[PDB]
Amino acid sequence: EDLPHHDEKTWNVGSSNRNKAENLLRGKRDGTFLVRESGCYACSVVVDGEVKHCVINKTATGYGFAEPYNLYSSLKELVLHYQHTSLVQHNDSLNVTLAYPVYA
């Protein structure tokens, strides 16, 4: 019953790239997502039938999608927040939550 997001291996694919992310998310439902590393981090998430990508900033104050909200202490804390809060506030093309970990 607890969210699958609590196991970071269900969504953090480690060192990867945009193409690999597209192949992993192809055919997945809206809200399926992953976090990838290498520009250190990014989020790939399915929105309205398309795979979308955005940067995850790693700053002095924490992780986030945009200032003044780069304040999450870890990637897991970031993911848990955006599991219930839409990314739409940061981008009108990203009206989605991080609902389904790619490997859950």
UniProtKB/Swiss-Prot annotation:
Domain of life: Eukaryota
Domain SH2: from-to ranges: 11-102
PTM comment, free text: Polyubiquitinated in T-cells by CBLB; which does not promote proteasomal degradation but impairs association with CD28 and CD3Z upon T-cell activation. Phosphorylated. Tyrosine phosphorylated in response to signaling by FGFR1, FGFR2, FGFR3 and FGFR4. Phosphorylated in response to KIT and KITLG/SCF. Phosphorylated on tyrosine residues by TEK/TIE2. Phosphorylated by FGR. Phosphorylated by CSF1R. Phosphorylated by ERBB4. Dephosphorylated by PTPRJ. The relevance of phosphorylation by PIK3CA is however unclear.
Role according to the record: Binds to activated (phosphorylated) protein-Tyr kinases, through its SH2 domain, and acts as an adapter, mediating the association of the p110 catalytic unit to the plasma membrane. Necessary for the insulin-stimulated increase in glucose uptake and glycogen synthesis in insulin-sensitive tissues. Plays an important role in signaling in response to FGFR1, FGFR2, FGFR3, FGFR4, KITLG/SCF, KIT, PDGFRA and PDGFRB. Likewise, plays a role in ITGB2 signaling.
Domain notes: The SH3 domain mediates the binding to CBLB.
Subunit structure: Heterodimer of a regulatory subunit PIK3R1 and a p110 catalytic subunit (PIK3CA, PIK3CB or PIK3CD). Interacts (via SH2 domains) with CCDC88A/GIV (tyrosine-phosphorylated form); the interaction enables recruitment of PIK3R1 to the EGFR receptor, enhancing PI3K activity and cell migration. Interacts with PIK3R2; the interaction is dissociated in an insulin-dependent manner. Interacts with XBP1; the interaction is direct and induces translocation of XBP1 into the nucleus in a ER stress- and/or insulin-dependent but PI3K-independent manner.
Record-stated family: Belongs to the PI3K p85 subunit family.
Protein's recorded name: Phosphatidylinositol 3-kinase regulatory subunit alpha
Organism: Bos taurus (Bovine)
